[PDB]
């Protein structure tokens, strides 16, 4: 599954619904090891709207726990990310995930 761990909160009562855009700022590594992408080096926050099967399950089911201004990491089993075939240059097979992700707003 998505642990959710707190690095910094939001404010308890404003958290993503269907259909609403979600903008974050994240940075993905393998757990305890290497980056494979952040958000930040692009210096332009990542957008997807919640309910429309737009991202990995894990971030799906992980940033919903979220509120508004919440920092947070987010530890994903690969059957909650890419699973046993991986996505090719970029996640391996069979690989757990950690996304540290900001939850900046909702539009
Ligand atoms: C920047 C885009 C998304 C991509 N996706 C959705 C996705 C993943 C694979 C193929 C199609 N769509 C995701 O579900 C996850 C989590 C949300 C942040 C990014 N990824 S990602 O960091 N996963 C290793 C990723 C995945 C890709 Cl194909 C490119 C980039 Cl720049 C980043």
Same mark, same amino acid.
């Given at each position: 599954?998505?642990?959710?761990? #707190? /690095?910094?909160?939001?404010?308890?009562?404003? *958290? +993503?619904?269907?259909?609403?855009?979600?903008?974050?700022?994240?940075?993905?590594?393998? &757990?305890?090891?290497?980056?494979?992408?952040?958000? =930040?080096? =692009?210096?332009? +926050? *990542?957008? *997807?709207?919640?309910?429309?099967? %737009?991202? /990995? =399950?894990?971030? &799906?089911?992980?940033?919903?726990?979220?509120?508004?201004?919440? =920092?947070?990491?987010? #530890? /994903?089993?690969?059957?909650?990310?890419?699973?046993?075939?991986?996505?090719?240059? /970029?996640?391996? +097979?069979?690989? #757990?995930?950690? *996304?540290?992700? %900001?939850?900046?707003?909702?539009?």
């Amino acid at each position: 599954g998505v642990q959710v761990e #707190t /690095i910094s909160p939001g404010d308890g009562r404003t *958290f +993503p619904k269907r259909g609403q855009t979600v903008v974050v700022h994240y940075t993905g590594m393998l &757990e305890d090891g290497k980056k494979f992408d952040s958000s =930040r080096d =692009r210096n332009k +926050p *990542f957008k *997807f709207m919640l309910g429309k099967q %737009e991202v /990995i =399950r894990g971030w &799906e089911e992980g940033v919903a726990q979220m509120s508004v201004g919440q =920092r947070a990491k987010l #530890t /994903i089993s690969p059957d909650y990310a890419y699973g046993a075939t991986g996505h090719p240059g /970029i996640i391996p +097979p069979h690989a #757990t995930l950690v *996304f540290d992700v %900001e939850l900046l707003k909702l539009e």
